């Protein structure tokens, strides 16, 4: 009722209470990114075609090989707007560093709330240094989710994932350059195709260059189980 600027009410569901979101946002260069948490179809995409010109199609890869291994991703300071980005291995990230909902991908989108580091649900908006997200993961079906993405305190999308495939590295489904390089073996986040990321309410925030991707009702299987979900593709 008081302080009318909070309306982060746009289906960030799955969190026992809203006090489970970590909300440490700075916008210190004053660019408008933080306003995107609340105003969703306003992204200025005029710089984007340049940003994603930088990323290179799956066509740069070669059939053959056969011995797919796994490797830890780099986690370069590049924003992970590109599919090919090899996430850093998922870990224990302090809530002191993050702004807005945190999503992991099973592939289906899921939300992680702030916990005790022991693992007990915290309800302090992410203020105390005892508030963290535990994102350690293993690929489903046995594991929990393939990877997670969220937002920096200062307007940078962060990415967290299971080790991409080797042989040359593939963190999504690139079945054309090897028939076992499926998503279920190599998927490390929301990108299930070099052209398709999964849809969730904060995709346009975290992945704002995907503004014009089309949204499809799809079906995927990790070890035979069926996830119905929606994906955005170009």
């Amino acid at each position, epitope marked *: 009722p008081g302080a009318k600027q909070n309306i982060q009410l746009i289906n960030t569901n799955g969190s026992w209470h809203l006090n489970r979101t970590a909300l440490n946002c700075n916008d210190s260069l004053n660019t408008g990114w933080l306003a995107g948490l609340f105003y969703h179809h306003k992204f200025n995409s005029s710089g984007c075609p340049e940003r994603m010109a930088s990323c290179r199609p799956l066509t740069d890869f070669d059939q053959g090989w056969g011995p797919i*291994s*796994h490797a830890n991703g780099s986690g370069p300071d590049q924003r992970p707007y590109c599919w090919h980005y090899p996430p850093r291995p998922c870990g224990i990230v302090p809530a002191k560093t993050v702004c807005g909902p945190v999503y992991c991908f*099973t592939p289906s989108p899921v939300v992680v709330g702030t916990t005790d580091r022991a*693992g007990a649900p915290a309800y302090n908006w992410g203020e105390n240094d005892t508030d963290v997200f*535990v994102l*350690n*993961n*293993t*690929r*489903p*079906p*046995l*594991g*929990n*989710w393939f990877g997670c993405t969220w937002m920096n305190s200062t307007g940078f999308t962060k990415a967290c994932g*299971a*080790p991409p495939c080797a042989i040359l590295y593939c963190p999504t489904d690139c079945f054309r350059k090897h028939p*076992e390089a499926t998503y279920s*073996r190599c998927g490390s986040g929301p990108w299930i195709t070099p052209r398709c990321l999964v849809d969730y309410p904060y995709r346009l925030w975290h992945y704002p260059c995907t503004i014009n991707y089309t949204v499809f009702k799809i079906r995927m299987y990790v*070890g035979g*189980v069926e996830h119905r979900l929606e994906a955005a593709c170009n």
Partner: antibody
Amino acid sequence: QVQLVQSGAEVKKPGASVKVSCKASGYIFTSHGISWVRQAPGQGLEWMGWISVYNGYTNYAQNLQGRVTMTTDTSTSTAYMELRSLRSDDTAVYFCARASQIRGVDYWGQGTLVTVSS
Amino acid sequence: SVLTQPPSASGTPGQRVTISCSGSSSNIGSNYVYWYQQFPGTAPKLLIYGNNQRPSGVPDRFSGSKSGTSASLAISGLRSEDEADYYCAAWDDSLSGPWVFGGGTQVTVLG
């Protein structure tokens, strides 16, 4: 220190059922899944099945004919394998082991001896 | 077993014993081999995962390779302590799957 320790050994009559426990400590329980492997005295290792701690997916060894059901408790950091309709070849040490896509079935409890004798 | 191991092998201390393991195109030919050491009355211990990697805490002499449809574990500098049961395991995508074990191979330091 990633540890699994199992419930003690029990004697069961043929046709009875048993439920073996297993406590995980030393990693994020929901990060990996949990597998069960029994060994009959003198024989090789038998894969019984798989459960996902996080989402609950299961895979069961098909010669167990829907006898075994596997369950976790995220609070207790404990996994439960239950076998029904016990027969004398169910006599076996029942192991509890962690499973993931890359490290496979990596870390094993001590085992539980299950003897089905009347 | 879906994976076939010789039941025994043996060597005199200081020798390098190999072990064989053979499968299909839907396990070794396409998935991760693992190796376990079981002493009698012990739970098996993981020795090798993803075909060649020793977990932290495994002597360098335990090496494991793979090619085509068969994988091998090596034990250089064979000591009395190595006498044990050794199992090869693997993912498997055919109806035999999803996880498959080997028959086992008892290795004897020739005393």
